[PDB]
Curated annotation (Swiss-Prot):
Protein name: Peptide chain release factor 1
Assembly notes: Interacts with the ribosome.
Protein modification: Methylated by PrmC. Methylation increases the termination efficiency of RF1.
Function field: Peptide chain release factor 1 directs the termination of translation in response to the peptide chain termination codons UAG and UAA.
Length: 66
RNA sequence: UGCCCGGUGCCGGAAGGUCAAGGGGAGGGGUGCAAGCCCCGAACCGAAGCCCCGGUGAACGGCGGCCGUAACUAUAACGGU
């Protein structure tokens, strides 16, 4: 349970970031897939289904052998 | 060579409370014609000891429980009771 958490949380530094929420520019970027939206008020309210599907896509595009 | 004198010890305290023999004798009782003889007896006075108020540990001795809380987990300097 510990080695697995540190595989996810790490040190918690500013880097190691997975997804930035920039309020001044109403932007929400997810750096693993190259996806950004601008519905920040909607993202921080629950409408995350866009980014998840966008993540699932690159995951299925990842599972391409060989 | 720390903290606890509530308990036991010892030390201190001419106040107060309790307190024995004794002092005292309100008031009774036995008997006798009686003078009387005999008995009981309340208040009150009346030590040490004990109570009571203090002190005291290189005197007898005693020196907690539960619950929470910090940049991963853990722990908990910290908080509550
Ligand atoms: Mg000692
Ligand atoms: Mg003591
Ligand atoms: Mg003592
Ligand atoms: Mg004492
Ligand atoms: Mg004394
Ligand atoms: Mg006598
Ligand atoms: Mg007497
Ligand atoms: Mg007498
Ligand atoms: Mg007498
Ligand atoms: Mg007569
Ligand atoms: Mg006395
Ligand atoms: Mg005593
Ligand atoms: Mg005492
Ligand atoms: Mg003791
Ligand atoms: Mg003992
Ligand atoms: Mg923690």
């Amino acid at each position: 349970l510990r080695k697995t958490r540190l595989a996810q949380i790490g040190t918690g530094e500013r880097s190691e970031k997975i997804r930035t929420y920039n309020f001044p520019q109403s932007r929400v970027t997810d750096h693993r897939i190259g996806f950004t939206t601008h519905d920040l008020e909607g993202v921080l309210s629950g409408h995350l289904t866009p980014i998840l599907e966008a993540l699932k896509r690159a995951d299925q595009e990842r599972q391409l052998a060989a």
